Amino acid sequence: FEFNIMVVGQSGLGKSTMVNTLFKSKVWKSNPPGLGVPTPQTLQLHSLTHVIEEKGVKLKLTVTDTPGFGDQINNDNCWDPILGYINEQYEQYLQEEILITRQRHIPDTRVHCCVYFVPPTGHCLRPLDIEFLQRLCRTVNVVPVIARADSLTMEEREAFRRRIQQNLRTHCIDVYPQMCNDKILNSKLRDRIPFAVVGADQEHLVNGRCVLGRKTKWGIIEVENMAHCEFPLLRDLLIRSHLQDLKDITHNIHYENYRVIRLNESH
Ligand SMILES: Nc1nc2c(ncn2[C@@H]2O[C@H](COP(=O)(O)OP(=O)(O)NP(=O)(O)O)[C@@H](O)[C@H]2O)c(=O)[nH]1
Ligand SMILES: [Mg+2]
């Protein structure tokens, strides 16, 4: 039924474009029309909702788009609006439970997974992103990705991925899937995280087939082709393979911890 995700990261990393790519993926039975217009810089936090379907199963997918950070001289406390929105949904869910005349089914607007966009510098994790991820992973599931990965070669993607994984362990950033016998499947996923993804809101004719891609002066970058980028790995993780596992952790771990602290401090 319901599933909510949110894109977070530095400004100019294709977060808004990735929102359109998730809804326009050719895996679903139908897609919204092609955009064909430059998306302006996101100034306000806003959520998009649409019902997608695959294999006859409908899903009410909600994606929250956020304004990018990291453009000021001093970016201190730039995580407050995003952390505030995450806790706002936990408070809404709690107030719906304690309502004396509460409805049968509680509307769930809690963020079930956060997609964190990392700049494709090719070096290591930035101190600004380290501070952001450490605060994020305490309250929400986080899956990091290498944004606009076509700016790096395949060799550069892998070397950058390994260096990101090194300082993730060094700074104790437990991203999803957390380490807490199917370890072989999650080890394969943790090997590829952060995914090297590419966004696209346009359809192009390549090899006689209509596919999503970015048209440049040298070729078409097919975003749903594993030979070009790893967007199918992110799409299958969020929507297909680990959808319920993300919701179970959000309700039983993250929201439960928020609810316990809220009720204990009120006696
Ligand atoms: N090379 C490349 N460019 C991309 C990709 N995705 C988006 N872009 C381009 O990058 C620019 C910024 O896109 P946008 O989605 O607005 O970024 P944003 O993170 O939403 N910015 P903001 O957070 O400030 O709103 C646009 O020109 C867009 O076409 C990608 O995968 N690769
Ligand atoms: Mg944007």
| Sign of the torsion formed by the C-alpha atoms of 224, 118, 169 and 173 | negative
Total domains in the fold of the chain: 1
| Cis upstream peptide for 232 (omega within 30°) | no
Strand partners, 203: 212
CA–CA gap between residue 32 and residue 10 (Å, rounded)? 27
Which residues have any ligand 1 atom within 6 Å of their CB? 11-17, 39, 41-42, 67-68, 148, 150-151, 198-199
Q: Which residue carries 């891609």 as its tokens?
A: 213
Q: Is 12 annotated as a binding residue?
A: yes
Name the experimental technique: X-ray
Give CA angle at 35 (145, 16), nearest 5°.
30
**Cα distances (Å, whole numbers) of residue 54 to 50, 112, 132, 159:** 13, 20, 34, 35
| CATH code (residue 55) | 3.40.50.300
Residue with CA nearest ligand 1 atom 9: 14
Q: Is 30 annotated as a binding residue?
A: no
Cα-to-centroid distance, 18 and ligand 2 (Å): 9
Entry resolution in angstroms?
A: 2.1
The per-residue DSSP string of 83-97 comes to HHHHHHHHHHHHHHH
Q: Is 241 annotated as a binding residue?
A: no
Instruction: Tell me the residue range of the domain where 63 lies.
Output: 1-267
Residue with CA nearest ligand 1 atom 8: 14
